[PDB]
Amino acid sequence: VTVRRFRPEDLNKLAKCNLDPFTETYELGFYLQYYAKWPSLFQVAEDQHGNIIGYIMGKLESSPDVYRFSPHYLPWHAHITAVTVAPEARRMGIGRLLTEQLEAAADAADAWFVDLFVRTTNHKAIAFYKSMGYSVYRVVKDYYGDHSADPSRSSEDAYDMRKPMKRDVKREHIREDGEKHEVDPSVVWH
């Protein structure tokens, strides 16, 4: 397995990974926007036969300055927008390898933390991130527009998970009891 930057020519090769039920298929322009703005953070894992068996998409940012007085304001941080590894290639360290490389970029950029949204029913991913030092910071109610298991539910909550980076010397951006803190999707901004 070799890790390298995503290139647009890879767009037709993500299909196998995106069959996974916890992996979203975004619109073309979305992938291409991450390629344009954060190309170093859009990485793919390819096997010896040329197939893409995983990828990760990340970004660096803070909340818009107009929200600087909100208790929900996010300082400069790295965000994992998507990560996925083909089911035949799991538990080989690919997910961790992709994540560690993004963390290294976040560390070099003085990010306060790395965060991500995860479906509350995605126990595999939750166990993965917890093993790497991520914890739940808050629950975003109704973040996902559908449920992963129950079609009668109109939505599914997200855990917003965070791993502290070394800039957070006082650990003021992580919580021990994050599952008890709920927010509405309206405090997630773009």
Partner: peptide, 4 residues
């Protein structure tokens, strides 16, 4: 995974 970000919401669609």
């Amino acid at each position: 995974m970000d919401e669609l």
